Symmetry: C2
Subunit: 114 residues, 2 copies
């Protein structure tokens, strides 16, 4: 186990924990990368990291995130670390046809409050 | 890096999914083994396996379980697979720290849920 993006995941887990959330990273790779919760809000996260100012994500992966989050009772979140601007969080919808994003598509960790 | 009873954990994941739950297994072994949700109920689970007809559960594990469940906002659950008899569950109260678990002192998956 341990995806190639394992280091990025660890960093996020720390950020989230730093904000009062309990978090676990998945051992298998057929669900979502992380699942977090603080008693009020519940997050199901897919983690990515890029050097560009835009990123393309496959339907398969995003469809999986949504189906999982829906059944679990958590918000389907794509966390992207743009190696220049910082972490951006995007709540994805099944209405989306092509999953390509820029930072303005998401919000900051804090803003993601609720 | 892989824990004993990973086979039992995979087994419990299927059972839960049969009941409508979305579930992930933890990569690290410092939190809880499984984390589940169905849209209205959230479970944080500690998985155990024994060839005996009883199992002593320590203070350290239960304290770890209760604390993580409290922060995450899920029901702390101990799940034990008693070979030659089946799975048994018990929602652990924050007022208990150690105990000997037997198949009868626990409940079936159906009752833990409904």
């Amino acid at each position: 186990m341990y995806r190639k993006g394992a280091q990025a995941e660890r960093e996020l887990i720390k950020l989230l924990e730093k904000h009062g959330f309990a978090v676990v990273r998945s051992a298998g790779s057929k669900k979502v990368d992380l699942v977090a919760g603080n008693g009020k809000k519940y997050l199901c996260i897919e983690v990515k990291v890029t050097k560009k100012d835009h990123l393309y994500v496959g339907k398969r992966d995003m469809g999986r995130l949504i189906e999982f989050s829906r059944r679990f009772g958590g918000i389907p979140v794509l966390a992207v670390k743009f190696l220049n601007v910082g972490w951006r969080f995007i709540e994805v919808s099944p209405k989306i046809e092509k999953f390509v994003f820029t930072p303005s598509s998401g919000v900051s960790l804090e803003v993601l409050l609720g």
